[PDB]
Amino acid sequence: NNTASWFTALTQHGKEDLKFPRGQGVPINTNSSPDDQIGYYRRATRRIRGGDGKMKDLSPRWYFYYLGTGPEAGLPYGANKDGIIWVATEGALNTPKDHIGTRNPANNAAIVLQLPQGTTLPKGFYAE
């Protein structure tokens, strides 16, 4: 607890897991350096009780954590895990980003997720 993504989420409207072409997907953060531009998005599921007394699955959200941080801080880049997808800018260093760490919501609001010009969000994904 008291740990969160530095950024706002991507929402999934389709059936396919989030996926970026190699070199794309790392949110913009002016307080970070070129070496730091690598990590993962982790799926967060939500469901609520409908009018019919059955659980309704809402659109999955995906949140970015820098490599070596967050709920999967221990996973190396490329590790295969459901709900985890990897992104990296060319020339980012494969080193943990402990100097960036995660966000404490008591101290800092999320950075608005923004992707560098020319980036393609996959079908059905939107930055809310």
Residue numbers in the entry: 47 to 174
The article reads:
In particular, the N protein interacts with Nsp3 to facilitate viral replication and infectivity. The coronavirus nucleocapsid (N) protein interacts with non-structural protein 3 (Nsp3) to facilitate viral RNA synthesis and stabilization.
Particularly, Arg92, Arg95, and Arg107 are also potential nucleic acid-binding sites of NTD in SARS-CoV-231. The SARS-CoV-2 NTD has been identified to possess an overlapping region between RNA- and Ubl1-binding site, suggesting that Ubl1 and RNA could affect each other for N protein binding.
